Amino acid sequence: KMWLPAPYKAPAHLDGSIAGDYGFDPLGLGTNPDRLKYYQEAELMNARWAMMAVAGIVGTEVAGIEPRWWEAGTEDYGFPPAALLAIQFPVMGYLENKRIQGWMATDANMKLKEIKNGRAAMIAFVGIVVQAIVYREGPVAALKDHISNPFGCNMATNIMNIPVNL
């Protein structure tokens, strides 16, 4: 029910009405209700983007289109980055403006599943970024190396062995 064991009592501002509410506001950020709603929407957005990013990275690496996802910007698609920003910014500005106007204008199990998979995707994306920083192998390859040699490949060793693999 709660992010801590049974004698943990949630703070007042998290009454359990929202999906995936485990009373985890140790800093008390969501005390203001209107800010709590804005943060609910921000969590949903960052979560959905983390899902899309993890799914895209694993797709491009398992199927082998783009290994080592971090240099996808350097790869040549024939369409240079400057005009890519020039076309992305109007379209994404339109999409995000329409979305935020909808949000301001306004199944529980499905919503809870979405938010939980979002928190998981956020954690997964952070892990992908930091592993890529320290190890310079793709995520699936990092997984394969962990499976082959778990004690030879992990954070407590990859941090110990940055110079030998970079």
Partner: peptide, 14 residues
Amino acid sequence: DTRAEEASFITSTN
């Protein structure tokens, strides 16, 4: 100072 609300996890201990 509503942001000075005391936390709840600081007393949840067996």
